[model samples]
Structures are given as structure tokens and as C-alpha cells.
Target chain A: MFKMKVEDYFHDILRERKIHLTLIDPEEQTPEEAVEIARAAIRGGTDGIMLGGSTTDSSELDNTARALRENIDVPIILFPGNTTGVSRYADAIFFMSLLNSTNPYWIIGAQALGAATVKKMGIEALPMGYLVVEPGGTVGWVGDTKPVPRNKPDIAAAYAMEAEFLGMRLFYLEAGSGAPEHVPEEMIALVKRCTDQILIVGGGIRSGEDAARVAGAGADVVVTGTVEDKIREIVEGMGSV
Target chain B: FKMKVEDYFHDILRERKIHLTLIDPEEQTPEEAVEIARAAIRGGTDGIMLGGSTTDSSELDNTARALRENIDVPIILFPGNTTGVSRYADAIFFMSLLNSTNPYWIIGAQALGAATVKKMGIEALPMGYLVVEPGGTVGWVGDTKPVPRNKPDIAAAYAMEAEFLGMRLFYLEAGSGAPEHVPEEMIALVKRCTDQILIVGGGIRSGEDAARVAGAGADVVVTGTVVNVEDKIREIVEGMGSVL
Candidate 1:
């Protein structure tokens, strides 16, 4: 665990400027390689690191989780996809719900099953609502989402409001792992208008142009899994905003 | 899409008294495990329970998968922990150790294992579990203040409460290889106190022991740690049948 509360850390960072989080998928690389990638993101000014994938083995996760914490300064937040995604080494986790999934297991069952592990490992769970937008990439298919229509900001806004009223503090608008285009600026701006919950957007963000436009539109944090080479450029772009 | 396992559980109980054999996959190889159930089936066990205090998940799967192939009886899981689940199980005792000191055993582990149980499509058999005196590994591991065997009124009270709370099955345990079974008066009083399906286990080492418990009104009897179930189980089944 960190010396400070991760929840307080996020709230504190947001007071300064929009944040940048680098998402590292364990299925994409070995533990040694993730350290190299994680080092670049920190150097590039990423505020934190998010680790997980749709399917992961327990030992593999612990190995990677252990490796990242030994070398990195930022809090490693587990964005778990299932029980196997939990590890004892992480400082915290985004204990979230895939609010739009057709399956109840994704919404409630997974949370119940991972709850004890969270307690046993002493990881801080930060509640958040996970929403998938149109072009719902791998996550949409895996989570069995009825992806929120691209043009209807109201639907996503409604879920966000319900999430906050239900005591959630964060709203994640995901377009998925490899999208064709980012969440439309209109939807992000509209969602921001609806709630004070820290708004996060990911998928289809590729460059300084994409990052800057998203920050300007009101996403509190922008997440990228495919931006190892463009980390500095995107952080510099968001800084300019 | 299909009939609930609860339907099957009640249907079987309504017909006659039942005997279920508990198999700890940790005790034998998956190959040897199936033979144990097979022999118990020949001796007249109505169901096979896959459970123990600390069976590995892989062993649970291997034993369950093998049993599914060799036996026609329902494969029920009496999970010792969160790792006690398997996709091959037909149903599980989705239980809460009502007397546990730690809330984690009572509900926290349930919350953590519920999603996997659902995803695996296994039927959840909701029951309230109680541990009686001389509580063994399960008693120690679950952090239970095992109910005193002499306190029949206390056992009756717990059974009444669990049934009123919507639990259909109420279990009274004496722990594996216990010195003595849960008292017959305790069993009779719990049955009188609640309409729930009552199952009793631990230290019923003979047909006589099983009959006495069944005669007192246990709807089902569970046995583990027998050395030659092939020869002794038939006697136990015949003894339990003598009562119902």
C-alpha cells in the first residue's frame, strides 16, 4: 500500500490538471517487458498505472504486480476482469461494475467473488461505473455489452447519474481496447455536464491531437494502452490544454 | 431453462430417507476417487458429495469430472472454501456457517465465490450450516464455537431462525472423525422446531449410528472416513432405510 490514500491522490491530482494513466495489459507482455513500458510512461508524465485484461492467470498476475511495484513510484491500480485478476501486491483496485452488460455475473457476481480476496490482500477498492460506448471493442464483446449508441449521450449520462447517486465516485466511458475512433467530443462534454464524478475515457486515443481534444472536452483522465511510444507527446499535448 | 436442483433435493427427500457419501479429492487420486463413489453407489448411497476442508480446485475438478462419468447420482459440492467449486458439480451447498466468529466465512466468501458459481452454471443449494461439539478441522478452520451437544434448546433456536430466514436446508454437524455424533435429543429437537430439511453428519461410523440419528428425524445422513464402504455402506444404508 502507498503512504497516502489513492482516493485522495486522485482527487488531489485532479485539482492541478487532467491526469494521464497508462494501461498495461498483462496478456500483452511478460513482467520484465512491462517494467520497461511502465518506466517510459512515468518518464512521459503518466500520473498512475492500470493493470489487467479480460482473462488472466493468478501466478502471472502476481509476478507482474510484484515486478511493477518494485520499480515504479505511482500506485498500481488493478482494473480486474475477474477473480484471477486480483493480486496481493497492488496498492489499489478499481472495484467496478460493467453497468451495461447483459449478464448479471459481470454486474454483481464478480464483485461478490472478488470481495474477500480484496479484503485478504488489503487492497483499496475505489468504486466506479464502467460504461462501454459504440464501437465497443474487445471489452464490449467480452463483457456482453449492449454498447451505448454513439449519438445518444443521454443514455450514458443517465447511467453516470445513477452510478453517482448509488454512491459511485468515478465514471469510465470505454470505447474498448482497439476502437476505430475515440468517444465523440459531444458525448464526453455532455456526460461531464451531468455529474461531478471524475470522468475517464479510453480506447481510440492515439496521438497529441486525440489526447488534447479529449482533455479539452472534460475527461478528467485519459487512458491509453497503445501509447508507449507516444506517451510523452500525448502527456505534453494534455499539458498544453 | 431447466428444473432447479432444489426441486430434485426435495423430491428425493419426500420419497424416503437418503444417504450421501462425502469424498475429499485431496485423499486419493482422481482415478481412485471414482471407485470410492462407485462402491458407495453399489452399497446404496443416493448422492455423492465432493468436499473437504482444503481440497485444491484442480482436484475438485478432476474428481468431479470423473464422478460425472462413472456415477448416475447427483454430484453435490460441499465446498470447504472458495476453491471448493467446480463446473462439473450438479449442485452445491451454498452455505453460510451460521456460528462462525468471522463474518468472512458467513458471507464474505459467498460474495467472492457467487460469480464463479453462476458463470460455471452450477446449481446453488442454499443451506444454513451448524457445527456441534468436538468440532474437527471444519470447526477449527471455520472459527466456529461449536454448539454444545447437551444444549438441545440452543440448536433448536438456530434451526428455527435459519428456516424463518428462508433457508430450506438445515445442517447439524459433529465434525469429521468426531468422538461422538450430535446428540439424538439435539437432532429431534431441531427437527421439531423447524420444517426445514435436516441433514446430519460426522461420527456415524456404523449402520446402528446412522439408524439412531435417522430414527431421531434426520432427513439425510452423510458419512466420510470409512475404510471399506463397499462392505459397510450397504449395512448403513439398510440401517437408515429401516428407520424411514
Candidate 2:
């Protein structure tokens, strides 16, 4: 009965002049605590809750996903760091293929291992084309992917072309989980032009205006994480409803 | 030793056994990529892969800057996409994508290489590459016409062509996270057919898999996914060398 597409759910809100709210930084909160914050986040107009972190353990992730589901009415989605980050309790998963990294694990190693489990669970699988743009400073995604250079707009455009041609359902451009800069608009626009997928921008985004600008540039969903921890006040102000 | 990718061949000849590592500067920020290379050196890896499917060219420079500042172990460019040469990598992989119809991957990127390679002082390691074929759809395959799946003769023909062109190595790629390993028959046939040093990689998931490739005519086998689980590193180092 989970036939509704993530975009349909997201764009429906957009059509009605509503904002889709997303929560990040599950690593900071214990399962119970995350459940509490997610409850508040949903009450404050959040559409969904994202469960995962930059460097969290698999067990912690499983507990967090369980917590979000038990505590919230909205769908609990798995935003993973590695393969084992996935579990059956989550309603959906951003089945990620880090298109930017040369690391095979990000490419198919993790996906191959997780595919059966995801399919078995009958969870909604969103084929996400993942690109991690350089956050203007060193971040974990780089080291995690064995240190590849970040994509420029043009290179990312080529990759987006590859992603679209491969039948991926979504495009995700992260400036990194705790980046210093948001993804450049030109890159976002270029991706929108090259691919048919809905674009989601995240990382280092700490403001509503930043969210608005990304939306204005045609991003379907504007995501904020890491900010929930370091900039709780600003996150509260994000009004991501 | 401070050297280019080409110089690595010479360096490998000096040592009884060799260790290799490949890093992408584009996937992460510049500083972090360099730090990975440094960590590789500290961990006793003998050589570093400077580029591979990277979208940015500056990563080569960042990787070079980091390598140049540190302890030994040669840094070589294993370019994933076209960009100018980087001074950081001592040598560059002059790769000819044998299966791709795209002129750029085969030669266009190399057209301006002579002057750039000279300018950067990067040694050129001419490599003949064959995508062994990832069964399911993958990102890089769509980017270019991947090598025909299960075509042994075509793969061998390309290897002979590369050898004729004086390429020093042949890389058999199953294309990141391939469903199956490049069959041992493919490796044995290609190796039996050519004198070029064979490097079999992509989707090598275990120490035993690495050993099998090495025994089956792979001069060198790459194991990153499994080794990245460092608790298993000792098994990998030992298993990889067992067949050799």
C-alpha cells in the first residue's frame, strides 16, 4: 500500500505552498532522545524524519530508525553512511549510489549487499544518485571515499547525465553532512537540466533563506542536518514545515 | 622513492614484493584526500593511485602537494576523467579504453598529453584497459560504451593492440561493484595471449578472491572494499601474497 512516490508526497506539499521538513544529526541523540526530538520536529511541521549520521554505528542507526518509527506519524527514512545502516523498520531508504566516488563500495558493494534486504522488506526504495560536492574544506565523505576530488558543475553534469540514463529516481547533492558551504546554485541548476530526477540539496545549509534559494533554483527538497546539533537555535528558526 | 606512475614500474622491479594503493582526490575535499594518502604511506603501502573517475583536476595538485611534503612511496595518476596533468603525481596512466567508442577516453585526453606530461614532469604509464563488464547497469558503463561482456577474443585483441602500442600494463575492470569477478578464464586467456603485466580489479571482495586473481595470471590484484575493513587487513596482506 506504499505506492505513493516520495516526490509525489513532497511536491504535493510544494503545490499547496507547504515546506517539507527533515531532521538530521541522529548521532547526537540516543534512541529515546531522537524519538523525542523527532516527535517535536514532526509537530513543528516536519514532513518526514531522516535517521542516520556522518559516522554512526550500525546498531545505533537501527535503534534510531526504530525510535523514529515508534515515535512519529510521518514516514521514517534511512539516510545511510554505509550498507549496514539499512534496516526493515524504516518506511523508505535513499538507496544510494555515490556517483562521485571511485570507491567501489559506494558504487555497488554496499548497494549489492543491501539490495536483497531492502527488497525483502518491501520498503519504498528511492534510487538516489549521490554526489558529494566539495564543502570548501575537508570533511569525512572525502576520506570515506578514498579521497577523490570533488565534482565541478560541468563534471557533475556529465555524471547527472549518467545517472538519468541509468534510471535513478532522485539526485542528491550534499556539500557534506557538516559542510562549510551549500552546493552552488549553478551546479544544482545544471543537474536539473541534465536529469529528470528530483534534486535534494543538503549539508552546511543552516538557514531558511538558503533553503528558499535552493528551492527557487528548482530543488524539489531542501535538507538541513548537522545544523540541528551545532546551530539548534537556527535550526529551530528554519521553520522547515 | 619520489617518482611518477611510469617510475613505479622501475621501482617495483627493485623491491622483491610491492604494495599498491589508489586514492580519488575528487570525492572528498582536497585536504582530506591528501591525509588519506599520508595515512596510506604511514601504513606501509608502497605506491598510491592519484586519480580515478575524479570529476575535478585540482585533486591531482592537492594530492601531489601532500605527497611531495611527506615520506616516501610513489604517487601515480590513475585518472578517471580527462583533465590536465598534476605535478603531485609523479607518473600518469595513459589509459586507452579498448571497449569504448568514445574517442576521448581512448586518445582525445592523450592528444594534449605530450606537452602537459612534459610540463608536469609526470611519467606516462601507457595502459591498455578493458572493462570486463559489470552485469547490471552501473554509472561508468552509461558514461561510456563499456567493453562487451563475455567477449574473450575482443578482450585479447585489445590487449595485443595495447602491447603493440608499447603499453606496459593491461587493467581488467569489472567496473565498480560488478556482480561477478572477472572470470579466471578471462584472466588466464588474456594473460596467456599477452605479455603485458595484467592488473585485475573492481569487485575484488576478499583475500581469497585477491589470491585467485593473482594465481590466475593477474600480475597485481587490487582489494580495497575488503581491506577498508581494516580488522581484516592482516588477512588481506597475507592472502594477497600467498598466491604470488
Candidate 3:
């Protein structure tokens, strides 16, 4: 389990200006590989780590979370692609509501499926509003989200406002893994303007320049999965911004 | 939704035997499925269920739309999980895998999709779902321990409990690709015990298997994997009719 509370990180990161996080897809990496990456990301000055994937095989989730917990001291959040992405070993889960999803299940169904287990496991629940952006990759496809058009900042703003009104503590604007593009700065700025929720922007952010731009655009946290080797530079650069 | 799903169940079960075609979106393209649904409908399928546990909603809208255009039979969604919903369907089985080790299977997935079913006006059929012996893929996915094959009492207990829980339907799944059907004794026991619309499905591979289960007291017998051949589906439906 994560040693630090996600709430504490939120306050501390807000105080520190900005933060960078890594996403590890258990489906894509072996437990050993995920652990190795977490160690590197920690040394590279990454603020936190998130674990999950679309269509993840459940057998591997607990083992991987346990392994990551053993090797890392930072807050390890579950960025679950589905309800099955839970582990008693993790600190917290993004109790996510896909606001833009066409299916109510993704909107709240998955939350219902996982909430009891989450409570039983005593993992911290960070209610997050998830909105996918166009060119949204696998998450967009599986989540059934009506991707917020890249040009449509107002759409993102309205959805973010709804999340805040719904009592969500964090708002995640995702473009999808390896998305052809990242959530636009304009969209992030618009969403930031709409709510004081901890604004986390993720997907397709591959460089320090990309990370810095999104942070400067008002993202409280910039999450990256592909920019593993650049974590140090990205974290340092985003902080400099 | 077509009148009420419960309303059709009375007429279909009383007037004729029932055959439900299970269409998994992952198995075919919309065009291919439309043809299969047509053949199943021609073979006298009483209804169509559009889901398998592993299937997602990637092509659900198109598949449902295509099937609706081709068939007059009711399209009832058999969601493997919450993600298997389609707005185009007349109704959906809001199923709880009652035997699953996970609470999410029992209530969480249902709760997650409740508002959407209401919002979409998709008729919700509350089902007490159990996967029987030789639990296959769905059983594994749900983390269910199959009701012991020899234990009709366990199957009956679950069925009675489901009816008590306000479930209008009792679905006993042997799982897709099961090597054997749910025991005939189990079906008879559940039938004697509960008044809920009893649906028996999974691993029903032949006309004889369909007739046997229906004869054993299933109000509805659903078949999916075996229906890949139109001739076989027609034969199975014909055999089910012979039982009535």
C-alpha cells in the first residue's frame, strides 16, 4: 500500500506548483518490469504512480500492486480502466466517473461494481471525473466516451463543472494512451477555469516540453506513460514552468 | 421496450416453447450477425439476447440496429457485464451473478447500469444469475464456483433466493463452451421450486440437448455457439417446438 495519502499529495503538489506522474499498464508489462520502471521513475523525480489498463486480467492486479508497493514509497493510485483494476495493496483508486461516456455503466456502473470492494479493501477513494479527448485511443473505444473535440474547450469546461457540482475532487482530461495528440492546452485551461478540482491531464504527453506546456496551461498534474526515460527532465521542466 | 418483457414471457412460455439466440458482438461483424439473427429468427427463436461476458459494446449499436432491421423477434440484451448494454434493444437482463465471489458481479454492475437502463427506457429484467457446473469462461470471469453438478438443492436454493430478492427471472448458466449442459435434475429442481421465468443456457450444442433441457423444465433455453450454422439453429428450434 502507498505510504502517503492521496489527499496529502494533492495539497502538497498544489503547494509545490506542479507535479508529474507515471502510468503503468499491468497488461503491457510484467510485474518485474513494472517494478523496475517504478524504481526508475521514483529516482527520476516523478511525484506518483498509477496502475491499470483496459481489459486487464485480474489475476495479475494484486501481485503487481503488491510488488510496486514493495519498491516504491510514493502514492500509488489505481487508474483503473475498469472495476477489476483494484488491489488491497494500493493506496488509492481513481474512483472514476467517465462523464463523457455514452453508456451509463462507464459513467457510474463501473463505480458501483468496484465501490464495495474498494471500501472493503480500505483503499482511499479519490472521486475523479474522467473526460476523453478526440483521437482517444483504447480508453476512448472501451469507455464509449463521446470524445470532446480538440477544438471544443467549452465542452470540456462544462463537463468539468458538472464533475465539481457532482462533488468530484479531481478531474482527469485524457486523450488516450499513445493518443495521436494530448489534451490541448486550451481545453485544459478552460477546464481549470471551470473548477478548483485537482486537475490532472494525461495521455500522449511524451516529453518535458509537452509536460511543461500542459502544466503551464493550468494542469495541476501531468501524467505520462510513454515518457519513461524523460521523467527526470519532464518533472524538472514542468516544475520550472 | 416491447410491452413488458414479463408479459411476453407468459405468452411465449404458455403458447410455445422458447429459443433465445445469443449474439456476441465480438464474434461477428454487423452484417454477418444480421444474417445469423435472421436465420435464428426463421428457425422460430422467441427472442434474441445480445451479449456474451467477454463482448464489449464496440459494435453494439450497429449490431443491434442490424438485427432489429432483419428480425421481428424481441431483442433482449444478455449482458456479460455492464459494458454490454445497447440502447437499440427492447430490453436488457439486469443480471447479478449471484454465485460470484465478487460483490461487483452481484450488485455493482447492475447498480452502475440502472440509471442508464432507466434513461434509455430499456426494459430491465432483474435476474438472479447462477453459473452451474463445468463453469466456463463466464464463470471464470465472474469468479464463480459452479453449483455442484450433483447438487440440485444448491441450484434450487439460489433460485428461490433470487425470486425472494425480487428477481423476476432466474438464469442458470453452464457457461459458454461448457462440455456439458446444466444437469437435467438441476433444471427440474429449480422449476419445481421457483415461479420466476427460468432461463437455461450455455453449451447447448444440439436439438436434442435443447429439447432435453426444455423438457427438464426450462421456460427458455438459450443457445449461442452452436448457432453458427443456420441449419443447426433451425434444427434446434424445430426440436424445441417438438417438445411443446
User: What is residue B106's positional error in candidate 1, in angstroms?
Assistant: 1.0
Docking class of 2: incorrect
Let me know the TM-score candidate 3 reaches against the reference structure. 0.51
| iRMS per model in Å | 14.4, 14.8, 12.1
Worst 10 residues of 3 chain A by lDDT: A159-168
What class would a CAPRI assessor give candidate 3's docking? incorrect
Model 2 score (lDDT): 0.62
- Looking only at chain B, model 2 earns a TM-score of 0.84
True contacts kept of each: 0.00, 0.00, 0.00
Docking class of 1: incorrect
lDDT of 1 by residue, A1-241 (tens): 3667788999899888889998988878899999998888888889888999567887888888999999998989898888788888888888776777766556544664565556556677787878899999988988878899999887787667545533467889999878989999999998898777889999899888889989888899999985456788788778877
Q: How do all models score by TM-score? A: 0.51, 0.48, 0.51
Model 1, span B126-204: residue lDDT tens: 6878899988899999988899988887677667545533457889999989979889999999898778889999999
Residue lDDT tens for model 3, B91-185: 87877676775656654465456545656867767677888988888888887878889988778866754553346788889988888899999
- Give every candidate's TM-score on chain A: 0.97, 0.83, 0.96
Model 1 Cα shift for residue A120 (angstroms)? 40
lDDT of 2 by residue, A198-220 (tens): 77777767776676566666676
